[PDB]
């Protein structure tokens, strides 16, 4: 894999993300680093409004630009939603909206907190010399004390990284197919299946670091966007940058290149059809870093692994292929249980479109099994 910005040990996540910005931006950093406090004491908005319009020209490298996206994104979420009890600002102050929009066009990402920001760039290692384990990690920014942003963002990060291990065998898969190396292809498919099965284990930690009520009533609020959102009907106005208000979806793992890439690799047509689930996943690609979305479609232009495995009358291959698919539905099935516990139940103390969306995606995955009938 070339410079698709894919690291060998971290995958789509940003390797060792930057934690500090040039002193020239101390005003931004101070607000983002103290969000839990500023929101609760109610001085967050007045503070955002007192900011001077800072130039983004002093953000030279990619990492410092990513850190800034994270900072401005977290601040924007806090500004728009406030204490997150219903009072919402419909206009983002030009002194913040402008740098954020310019920085966004530069990185080719919408001006709203995105998965690539709050997960892929929002972490650090406590001990540089220890492994990437929950116990040795922390997020750079949270919204409110007790919002469980650490558990949510990091466990997502950890799942992403476990899945990354298979991203590196993708090349082996395509080489083996054209070189007609049957044994190599089988070994590769089984390896991918193993990595996806491990990611499922990682996913288990979500119960240990995220509490249903804090997640549902707090975190969820700050990660909402303004596209098809009732309380921000026409969207948000980025004062000084855009004439009318603009609609943008909130953070979602549907913006994760990781799960989208294996569906492509395996020939599962999540994006096909005109259905709502497909439109959503197709649209989420606009929220992924440009390098990552280029990876996704470079995968789509490679010959089909599915057709190859099918055209051969090789049970070994069919089974290795199916193990990969089976691993994806297992993950999606597990994730349904999680949505039931962290969203359905807390909301019970409409939102069925949610479960149907997830099931549609899972059913499309199951349908791809070859040897099921
Ligand atoms: C508190 C736990 C979690 C909840 C409540 C949750 C909730 C949701 C919801 C509501 C959606 C639907 C679309 C949207 O609104 O963005 C969704 C989609 C998705 N989530 Fe989660 N999620 C959780 C944890 C995770 C974790 C740890 C991962 C792993 C990185 C993950 C991966 C995905 C993916 C890939 C999709 C898109 C559809 C698919 O490929 O099946 N989620 N999630
Ligand atoms: C950050 C981390 C994970 C998510 C998410 C999980 N499931 C759907 N979106 C959204 C933002």
Curated annotation (Swiss-Prot):
InterPro entries assigned to the protein according to its UniProt record, in alphabetical order: Indolamine_dOase, Trp/Indoleamine_2_3_dOase-like
Record's catalysed reaction(s): D-tryptophan + O2 = N-formyl-D-kynurenine; L-tryptophan + O2 = N-formyl-L-kynurenine
Known cofactor(s): heme b
Cofactor descriptive note: Binds 1 heme group per subunit. In the active form, the heme iron is in its ferrous state Fe(+2). The catalytic cycle does not alter the oxidation state of the heme, but IDO1 is prone to autoxidation.
Top-level taxon in the UniProt lineage: Eukaryota
Residues the record lists as binding heme b: 335
Chief location of this protein within or outside the cell: cytoplasm
Keywords recorded for this protein, A-Z: Cytoplasm, Dioxygenase, Heme, Immunity, Iron, Metal-binding, Oxidoreductase, Tryptophan catabolism
Extent of the signal sequence: none
Induction comment from the UniProt entry of this chain: By IFNG/IFN-gamma in most cells. Exogenous inflammatory stimuli induce the expression of IDO1 in antigen-presenting cells such as dendritic cells, macrophages and B-cells.
Gene name of the encoded protein: IDO1
Example GO BP: female pregnancy
Molecular functions per Gene Ontology: electron transfer activity; heme binding; indoleamine 2,3-dioxygenase activity; metal ion binding; tryptophan 2,3-dioxygenase activity
Protein name, entry field: Indoleamine 2,3-dioxygenase 1
